[PDB]
Design an enzyme around this catalytic site. Structure first.
Site, mmCIF file in Angstrom:
data_model
loop_
_atom_site.group_PDB
_atom_site.id
_atom_site.type_symbol
_atom_site.label_atom_id
_atom_site.label_comp_id
_atom_site.label_asym_id
_atom_site.label_seq_id
_atom_site.Cartn_x
_atom_site.Cartn_y
_atom_site.Cartn_z
ATOM 1 N N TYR A 509 -36.939 52.667 24.726
ATOM 2 C CA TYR A 509 -36.562 51.511 23.933
ATOM 3 C C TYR A 509 -37.710 51.164 22.983
ATOM 4 O O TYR A 509 -37.593 51.325 21.772
ATOM 5 C CB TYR A 509 -36.257 50.308 24.829
ATOM 6 C CG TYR A 509 -35.747 49.136 24.017
ATOM 7 C CD1 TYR A 509 -34.483 49.175 23.429
ATOM 8 C CD2 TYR A 509 -36.557 48.032 23.762
ATOM 9 C CE1 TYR A 509 -34.044 48.148 22.599
ATOM 10 C CE2 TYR A 509 -36.131 47.004 22.938
ATOM 11 C CZ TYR A 509 -34.877 47.068 22.358
ATOM 12 O OH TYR A 509 -34.453 46.053 21.535
ATOM 13 N N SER A 592 -30.005 51.344 20.138
ATOM 14 C CA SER A 592 -30.547 50.359 19.192
ATOM 15 C C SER A 592 -31.971 50.695 18.748
ATOM 16 O O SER A 592 -32.186 51.694 18.059
ATOM 17 C CB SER A 592 -30.523 48.952 19.805
ATOM 18 O OG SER A 592 -30.947 48.055 18.771
ATOM 19 N N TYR A 593 -32.951 49.880 19.140
ATOM 20 C CA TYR A 593 -34.329 50.183 18.762
ATOM 21 C C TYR A 593 -34.671 51.520 19.409
ATOM 22 O O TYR A 593 -35.378 52.351 18.833
ATOM 23 C CB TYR A 593 -35.298 49.090 19.247
ATOM 24 C CG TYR A 593 -36.649 49.123 18.548
ATOM 25 C CD1 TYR A 593 -37.588 50.090 18.856
ATOM 26 C CD2 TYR A 593 -36.968 48.197 17.553
ATOM 27 C CE1 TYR A 593 -38.808 50.151 18.199
ATOM 28 C CE2 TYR A 593 -38.184 48.243 16.890
ATOM 29 C CZ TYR A 593 -39.103 49.227 17.219
ATOM 30 O OH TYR A 593 -40.321 49.284 16.578
ATOM 31 N N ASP A 670 -19.647 47.230 14.933
ATOM 32 C CA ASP A 670 -20.947 46.709 15.345
ATOM 33 C C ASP A 670 -21.431 45.645 14.367
ATOM 34 O O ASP A 670 -21.868 45.958 13.270
ATOM 35 C CB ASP A 670 -21.981 47.836 15.436
ATOM 36 C CG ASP A 670 -23.191 47.452 16.281
ATOM 37 O OD1 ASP A 670 -23.498 46.239 16.360
ATOM 38 O OD2 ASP A 670 -23.828 48.358 16.868
ATOM 39 N N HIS A 702 -21.706 46.577 19.237
ATOM 40 C CA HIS A 702 -23.013 47.107 19.590
ATOM 41 C C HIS A 702 -23.088 47.571 21.038
ATOM 42 O O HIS A 702 -23.822 48.504 21.357
ATOM 43 C CB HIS A 702 -24.085 46.049 19.341
ATOM 44 C CG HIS A 702 -25.466 46.529 19.637
ATOM 45 N ND1 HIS A 702 -26.111 47.456 18.847
ATOM 46 C CD2 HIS A 702 -26.292 46.278 20.679
ATOM 47 C CE1 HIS A 702 -27.273 47.763 19.394
ATOM 48 N NE2 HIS A 702 -27.407 47.062 20.507
HETATM 49 C C1 LIG Z 1 -31.270 46.744 18.985
HETATM 50 N N1 LIG Z 1 -30.775 46.094 20.049
HETATM 51 C C2 LIG Z 1 -31.419 45.875 17.682
HETATM 52 C C3 LIG Z 1 -32.243 46.669 16.702
HETATM 53 C C4 LIG Z 1 -33.640 46.151 16.954
HETATM 54 C C5 LIG Z 1 -34.123 45.528 18.231
HETATM 55 C C6 LIG Z 1 -33.413 44.728 17.208
HETATM 56 N N2 LIG Z 1 -32.165 44.630 18.048
HETATM 57 C C7 LIG Z 1 -31.547 43.559 18.535
HETATM 58 O O1 LIG Z 1 -30.357 43.602 18.815
HETATM 59 C C8 LIG Z 1 -32.315 42.234 18.729
HETATM 60 N N3 LIG Z 1 -31.436 41.239 18.197
HETATM 61 C C9 LIG Z 1 -32.821 41.866 20.178
HETATM 62 C C10 LIG Z 1 -31.710 41.832 21.251
HETATM 63 C C11 LIG Z 1 -32.254 41.508 22.685
HETATM 64 C C12 LIG Z 1 -32.987 40.112 22.667
HETATM 65 C C13 LIG Z 1 -34.058 40.088 21.541
HETATM 66 C C14 LIG Z 1 -35.120 41.109 21.885
HETATM 67 C C15 LIG Z 1 -34.472 42.516 21.988
HETATM 68 O O2 LIG Z 1 -35.532 43.398 22.271
HETATM 69 C C16 LIG Z 1 -33.328 42.564 23.060
HETATM 70 C C17 LIG Z 1 -33.871 42.887 20.624
HETATM 71 C C18 LIG Z 1 -33.501 40.459 20.131
#
Ligand SMILES: *C(=N)[C@@H]1C[C@@H]2C[C@@H]2N1C(=O)[C@@H](N)[C@@]12C[C@@H]3C[C@@H](C[C@@](O)(C3)C1)C2
Ligand SMILES: *C(=N)[C@@H]1C[C@@H]2C[C@@H]2N1C(=O)[C@@H](N)[C@@]12C[C@@H]3C[C@@H](C[C@@](O)(C3)C1)C2
Ligand SMILES: CC(=O)N[C@@H]1[C@@H](O)[C@H](O)[C@@H](CO)O[C@H]1O
Ligand SMILES: CC(=O)N[C@@H]1[C@@H](O)[C@H](O)[C@@H](CO)O[C@H]1O
Ligand SMILES: CC(=O)N[C@@H]1[C@@H](O)[C@H](O)[C@@H](CO)O[C@H]1O
Ligand SMILES: CC(=O)N[C@@H]1[C@@H](O)[C@H](O)[C@@H](CO)O[C@H]1O
Ligand SMILES: CC(=O)N[C@@H]1[C@@H](O)[C@H](O)[C@@H](CO)O[C@H]1O
Ligand SMILES: CC(=O)N[C@@H]1[C@@H](O)[C@H](O)[C@@H](CO)O[C@H]1O
Ligand SMILES: CC(=O)N[C@@H]1[C@@H](O)[C@H](O)[C@@H](CO)O[C@H]1O
Ligand SMILES: CC(=O)N[C@@H]1[C@@H](O)[C@H](O)[C@@H](CO)O[C@H]1O
Lengths: 728, 728
Positions: A509, A592-593, A670, A702
């Protein structure tokens, strides 16, 4: 002879973790739902009464999705017709059931398609949001009072958040805050008039002939942001024939000179509210403390009382400025602040003073302040044994800070190293919740002398069943990179044998302040891959990861997609050296990330990885939302950080992908990480002639979490990894 | 030969077919561009000279996309800034160049973003469309006269088609028709006001932050259609002071009672127009003959010369009512009609009299009427040797119908069995174009005694290159199913050995009136598949297929997705019998209607097919457009044919897909077969738990033809097919 833990076991949830979700309703009693019966429990003695029989509402006419009991026990809200929107937001219908009588109240019903509803902290007042406006009911059967009239779909939101506030700031749809008395209703108003709209098709059931287009106000990085205002209304002086008057509380001038966010709201007493504001460049925030003037009927915030929080190294707070916890009298409070060595510890502030005092210190971090009495402050930290991925409950004697006693460290040291907690009112009792590394364990305790009262759930049923399966085990350890410890975990096949060479899957992650190596017990896809497919699933926390201080966490500042991508690679090399990994079969994947990092790693040319899977990846930071992205990357302008924005795309690395097998997956609906991000990846790969595998999931968001899609994506991914690892 | 025809050879056009594209500019001359020079040729004597030198526009500045020379040779149209819209439509910029003065026109220029331009048939008038309005220039350097004022984007189209008319009715963007004189300009006007919009995302370059939403008026089956009006303007009476008077000609009353189409416009003389109209239920069509009343300035279409065409078994025409070919005087015409036995033959109509007289007859069909003189009518047919997949030029003596001479049959019977033709003005000369079975051959002829004058291109250059390559052969033959012959072709690997077993790829289209077994020579994907991977590529023409009479073409009427699907399955079984097919390795694939048939086939649970590929498939007929779908399927109402609409979807067969390997490909910006159709297929497969492979191509339309995408998709399909067949 014993079976393995199969994909199907994961998919159909054959082995379930039992929970014990309780809600404290006073200083000595909690509510617990049992076989759909709602019981009240007495903490000291453990005896219970049935508060709501599971047979009540058998003939109610709808399946009841959720309930909420007014604080003083006289009513229960029944939620039904639930329709989910984003991660937190949803719409629903509501009935109220008078418990004293035994009737559903029949008139002045909360309307259908209500967006949010809350009881007041005491009594049985209601506040709800319908069509983006706020309403208040003094009694459940009386006509409500309309508080706002400005509500407009997609444009003005009163008492609820817009998309980006829900997802990135409050982590909640609600933007309503009752005073502890129930006397005042505080709320925010968001204005999205000029926020651009992300548009995408929703295809719906086969019977729909023309696809629908969904349009959501959504600020991408550098775009025009919603604006916010803050109001407080006196709910005791509402009139049948006079519109209610809201008093606005303005942000501090140092916020008004530019774009800013309201980021925290917390009542200190019946007549004092704390507001935290954050500049769009998220390295500077202000806490405002505002008192009610009962003579003026107005609210004033003395500048003397303002508190300022700045960061030189990165941004303010982990994801946002931390919540303050006020002493009973409201004249002081405690909150987590990064100290001078960069570790987050508990700081004591006095409202009319300038500086705070650190109450804790050391090479570890406080995770959260959980409770405060006049004698003690209770907090979670990762101090025990110097493990960042462990979590324990501590209490500090407020009269002598050198007296910290760990309250959870020794209860069950082999089974339990990751705790969270829930205190009753006034912290008379608390429930401990251990999540690993053993099976989850729920215990009830008395604060008087921190004596164990009883076991609530020990998950013995799950224990029986698992003795019949070959479970994987988990190693939590660290490696050294340039003179510093970085932690990883490995999920190891059963009957692990360090003389044999195993394929390795790196689960990543690695977003800012993430932690993938910890002590919690999980049953997931990785359990399957290790137990049945004899794969090692590794995760590594490199630079950018959280809970180990700012030097590590902020290394990534203004530089997303660099150090945390290199570190995942170097960790993989080091794993390769170990004599039980086949260096010819190393894979990587994430969501995601994690999908971004997976893609950047696969496109790095490191040659370390055979194949990878990216699910719902960010690909370019200009595509993701302003609040999250700008927090780390600043603005995508030539004056700020445009150049690393452009330097950190997956697309720029297309060519290197011909060295690996790549599976790219994304939901078409998404709302969070738009399909766009993935569509630009695939297009860049096509332009340079790289073959790869793709899969879209029609109308999934998502989470890709409808039962059938969820089974399908993990089935598809298993096949891909099995084939990439030459597993039969 | 040692070397084979490779995927790269296909993808990169190593071996090119040469063509000979000329345009006749009179009865005995034609223009042909060699290098970038435009040459004028004299047909009788074969001598030639340079009309326009390739070095004339070096200083022009823009890249010239195409040119059009006025009839009288005085001016030429230069087209640059070409921007493609749909299959035929595009916008462009235009310059005019005076050939006698040898200079560019600079005054009163044709606007940027012009949507269509056309010289009058005689002289040098210009008519063009801009912003959906029609304009006329009498002289290339004089101000244009505006003809219409009603044009509005996506709503009112003057002189150009909307989407469904361009694609399904006129096969053209143009909706302007000059009278032979150049005196009158007739044009159609389309009204899309109430036509629903199809909407989809276009992602564009990486730099675009928010995806753009495309919106196109597109009637799906059963939805509101565009409406049409028809107008004629006298070009010789245009004033710079007064507005242009457009005379409307209204559809017949038998058309006015409901939804209908304008389906064909044909000028007969200087003062006589032919219009054909079509009811939305496309088994009824009316032809109007309209004459100019010189004294009133009006157009009258008298019912005495109104003609009706009906079908009882199907629709009218192959895809639309056939074109009338008038004799010089305008008092009679020939057009193709289905006869008493269901075969399409040339009929002779006299304007004011009933019925017509068939002048051809037999078990075979006329493909088109090509030219008409005082003495002869020329037509193409598949009479020769009873091969429905061959095409030959004939002429019928008008004064004695029993005298039919085949003009192409015996020119070179082993190389040439598929001709088209191009006649000069007044049919004094014709260019024959043979497309197979051997290499293409272009020849010039004179009509006086049908003498062969000279060879234009014989593709000798291609011939010698391919002698160095191991090329596949093509087998064209038939199987008998009931008492009916059905034709198929096989592309066979070089050195074909009938004692060996070969894998077989069934290449399908199979839509109504399609033909996939013919004697055309092609270098395409199948060539690579046979020559290099030793795969047999078969195509089968079953029920629904064309050029073999109505009994076969109409079998599929109101029942798309039945017999044409079954027959493909039945053909593969037949192929399985034949001892040179490994029936464990039979695949199928197709694009569009072929994508739909491929999926229906894979979903039939027949067990004949191991794997298949569907590209841009139709999945449910309610998703596709009204004009094409309704032509075969009627309306999707309970009182019409809704039951078979609902019974003929791909989605309802999802369960059977667990028996095969499936690859599903679609472009996201496909304006024709909407991505929606594959979006709903994958959703049904997910909900059913069936694994499959997929690939979207971002921003590609129906042809997925950008050279990077085209290379990518065929490379992707090649890998998929080779693994399904285990071909290392
Ligand atoms: C992936 N989940 C996306 C893309 C990058 C990380 C950004 N992300 C999010 O959705 C963020 N909105 C998050 C969701 C959740 C709570 C907060 C911290 C996080 O690491 C996990 C990412 C905001
Ligand atoms: C794919 N070829 C789609 C989907 C169904 C078959 C209809 N189709 C078309 O594109 C049609 N508009 C065509 C295009 C071209 C000319 C006409 C006959 C056709 O078979 C080939 C289909 C109309
Ligand atoms: C929630 C509950 O049942 N608590 C009961 C309490 O009401 C009762 O007064 C007491 C004496 O029996 O026992 C306990
Ligand atoms: C306050 C309100 O809207 N009540 C409605 C009720 O009238 C309706 O019959 C039912 C079904 O929608 O949902 C609830
Ligand atoms: C209720 C409200 O505050 N709406 C405002 C509107 O008045 C203003 O025109 C717009 C411009 O930013 O912002 C929003
Ligand atoms: C196209 C062409 O070159 N045609 C020429 C013609 O112009 C010329 O008059 C004649 C001379 O004999 O030869 C021929
Ligand atoms: C015929 C005409 O309008 N010419 C225009 C020219 O004036 C303009 O500079 C150019 C770019 O906009 O496009 C073209
Ligand atoms: C130029 C023209 O014909 N416009 C018509 C408009 O008058 C009519 O109201 C609409 C309804 O179908 O259709 C369109
Ligand atoms: C020559 C003349 O009268 N010009 C008119 C113009 O004024 C009018 O606007 C248009 C119809 O809208 O028709 C033209
Ligand atoms: C009685 C009958 O129709 N049986 C078969 C039918 O199944 C088949 O579709 C048709 C043409 O192939 O030949 C006949």
């Amino acid at each position: 002879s014993r079976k393995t833990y199969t994909l199907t076991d994961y998919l159909k949830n054959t082995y379930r973790l039992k929970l014990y979700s309780l809600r404290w309703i006073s200083d000595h009693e909690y509510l617990y739902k049992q076989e759909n019966n709602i019981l009240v429990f007495n903490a000291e003695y453990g005896n219970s009464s049935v508060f709501l029989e599971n047979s009540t509402f058998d003939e109610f006419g709808h399946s009841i999705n959720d309930y909420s009991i007014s604080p003083d026990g006289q009513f229960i809200l029944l939620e039904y017709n639930y329709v989910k929107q984003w991660r937190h937001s949803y719409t629903a219908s509501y009935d109220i059931y008078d418990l004293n009588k035994r009737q559903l109240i029949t008139e002045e019903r909360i309307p259908n398609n209500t967006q949010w509803v809350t009881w007041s902290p005491v009594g049985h007042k209601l506040a709800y949001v319908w069509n983006n406006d706020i309403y208040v009911k003094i009694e459940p059967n009386l006509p409500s009072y309309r508080i706002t009239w400005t509500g407009k779909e997609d444009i003005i939101y009163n008492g609820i958040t817009d998309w980006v506030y829900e997802e990135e700031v409050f982590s909640a749809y609600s933007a309503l805050w009752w005073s502890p008395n129930g006397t005042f209703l505080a709320y925010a108003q968001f204005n999205d008039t000029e926020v651009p709209l992300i548009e995408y098709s929703f295809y719906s059931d086969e019977s729909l002939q023309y696809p629908k287009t969904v349009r959501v106000p959504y600020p991408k990085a550098g775009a025009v942001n919603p604006t916010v205002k803050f109001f407080v209304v006196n709910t005791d002086s509402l009139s049948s024939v006079t519109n209610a008057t809201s008093i606005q509380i303005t942000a501090p001038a140092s916020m008004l000179i530019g774009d800013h966010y309201l980021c925290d709201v917390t009542w200190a007493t019946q007549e004092r509210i704390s507001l935290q504001w954050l500049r769009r460049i998220q390295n500077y925030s202000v806490m405002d403390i505002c008192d009610y003037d009962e003579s003026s009927g107005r609210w004033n915030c003395l500048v003397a009382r303002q508190h300022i929080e700045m960061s030189t190294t990165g941004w303010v707070g982990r994801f946002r400025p931390s919540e303050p916890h006020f002493t009973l009298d409201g004249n002081s409070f405690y909150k987590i602040i990064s100290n001078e060595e960069g570790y987050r510890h508990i700081c004591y502030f006095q409202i009319d003073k300038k500086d705070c005092t650190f109450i804790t210190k050391g090479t570890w971090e406080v995770i959260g302040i959980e409770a405060l009495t006049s004698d003690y402050l209770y907090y979670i930290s990762n101090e025990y044994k110097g493990m960042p991925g462990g979590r324990n409950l501590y209490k500090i004697q407020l009269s002598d800070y050198t007296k910290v006693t760990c309250l959870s460290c020794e209860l069950n040291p082999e089974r339990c190293q990751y705790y969270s907690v829930s205190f009753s009112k006034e912290a008379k009792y608390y429930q401990l919740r251990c999540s690993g590394p053993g099976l989850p364990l729920y215990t009830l305790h008395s604060s008087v002398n921190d004596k164990g009262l009883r076991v609530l759930e020990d998950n013995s049923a799950l224990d029986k069943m698992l003795q019949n399966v070959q479970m994987p085990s988990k190693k939590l350890d660290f490696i050294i990179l340039n003179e510093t410890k970085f932690w990883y975990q490995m999920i190891l096949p059963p009957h692990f044998d360090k003389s044999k060479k195993y394929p390795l899957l790196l689960d990543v992650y690695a977003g800012p302040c993430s932690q993938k190596a910890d002590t919690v017990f999980r049953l997931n896809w990785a359990t399957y891959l290790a137990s049945t497919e004899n794969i090692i699933v590794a995760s590594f926390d490199g630079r950018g990861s959280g809970y180990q201080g700012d030097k590590i966490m902020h290394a990534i500042n203004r530089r997303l997609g660099t150090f945390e991508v290199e570190d995942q690679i170097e960790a993989a090399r080091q794993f390769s050296k170990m004599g039980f990994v086949d260096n010819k079969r190393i894979a990587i994947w994430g969501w995601s990330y994690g999908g971004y990092v997976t893609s950047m790693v696969l496109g790095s040319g490191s040659g370390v990885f055979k194949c990878g899977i990216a699910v719902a990846p960010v690909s370019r930071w200009e595509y993701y939302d302003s609040v999250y992205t700008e927090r780390y990357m600043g603005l995508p302008t030539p004056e700020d950080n445009l150049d690393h924005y452009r330097n950190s795309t997956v697309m720029s690395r297309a060519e290197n992908f011909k060295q690996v097998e790549y599976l790219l997956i994304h939901g078409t609906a998404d709302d969070n990480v738009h399909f766009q991000q993935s569509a630009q990846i695939s297009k860049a790969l096509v332009d340079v002639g790289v073959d790869f595998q793709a899969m879209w999931y029609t109308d999934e968001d998502h989470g890709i979490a409808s039962s059938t899609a969820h089974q399908h994506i993990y089935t598809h991914m298993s096949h891909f990894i099995k084939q990439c690892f030459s597993l039969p």
